[PDB]
Symmetry: C2
C-alpha cells in the first residue's frame, strides 16, 4: 500500500458547493444524484468545509433548517483534508479520527482536486 | 493480528435497527435520517435477512417522485442479498464488498441477523495496523 498514493484512488472532478447556497436545495441535489458529500469551496477553489447527506439529513428531519439557511451557516469549521501525494495508509489513519467517511483531497496549493472515501480504500485493499 | 486473523464477529456493529417488509418506504427513509444510518436490513418475523434498502437509493427515488403513499419496503428492497457469516475473516468481508455496497448484514450458523459490518468498521480495524 506504500506505493499507492491518494491520487491513484480518489474521485476526481467532484461536484462542490459554495457557502452562499441553500442547504435544503443542496440536500435535494445530493439525493437526486446519489452524491454523499459536498466539499465546500471559495472562489479561489480552496476547501473551506464539507457537508454530507447523513449530517444535513439528520438535522433537516429535526426541522432545524429553513429555505433561507445556507451551506455556510451549517458546515463544520475544522474540515479534515488530505494531500494528493499522501499514501493510502496515511488516508486510513486520518479517517480514523472521530468515523469520517470521506476526505477532501487537495494538491500542493490546497486547491481541491478530489475526494477519497471509505469505498475507494476498500476497493483498493481488495486489489491486493 | 492480520486481516486473515480477525473474525467479522470482533468488529461488526451489533444491536442494529431493521425494517419489516410491510413498512412504508417514506417512514423508513425518515427513520434512516433520524438515526444517521445508511442501510436497513430487511427481516422477517424470525430474524432471517430477506433484503436490504439504502438511504442513497430510497432518497434518490423519493426526490424523483418514483414512489407513492402505498410503496412499502417490500416493493423496493434489493432481493438477492449478500450476507457474511460472523466466523469469517475481515478479508472475506472485503472481498464480498468489492464483488458499490458500503455494508454487509452478518448472519449466524442459522442465517439469523446478528449485526452489520461496514466499510467504516474495516477502516477502523486496518488503522490498528
Amino acid at each position: 500500500l506504500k506505493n499507492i498514493k491518494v491520487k491513484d484512488v480518489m474521485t476526481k472532478n467532484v461536484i462542490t458547493a459554495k457557502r452562499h447556497e441553500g442547504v435544503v436545495e443542496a440536500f435535494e441535489k445530493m439525493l437526486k444524484y446519489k452524491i454523499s458529500s459536498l466539499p465546500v469551496i471559495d472562489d479561489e477553489n480552496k476547501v473551506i468545509g464539507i457537508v454530507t447527506t447523513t449530517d444535513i439529513g439528520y438535522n433537516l428531519i429535526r426541522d432545524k433548517y429553513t429555505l433561507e439557511t445556507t451551506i455556510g451557516d451549517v458546515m463544520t469549521k475544522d474540515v479534515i483534508t488530505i494531500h494528493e501525494d499522501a499514501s493510502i495508509l496515511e488516508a486510513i489513519k486520518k479517517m480514523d479520527i472521530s468515523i469520517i467517511n470521506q476526505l477532501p483531497v487537495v494538491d500542493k496549493n490546497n486547491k481541491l482536486v478530489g475526494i477519497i472515501s471509505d469505498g475507494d480504500i476498500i476497493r483498493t485493499i481488495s486489489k491486493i
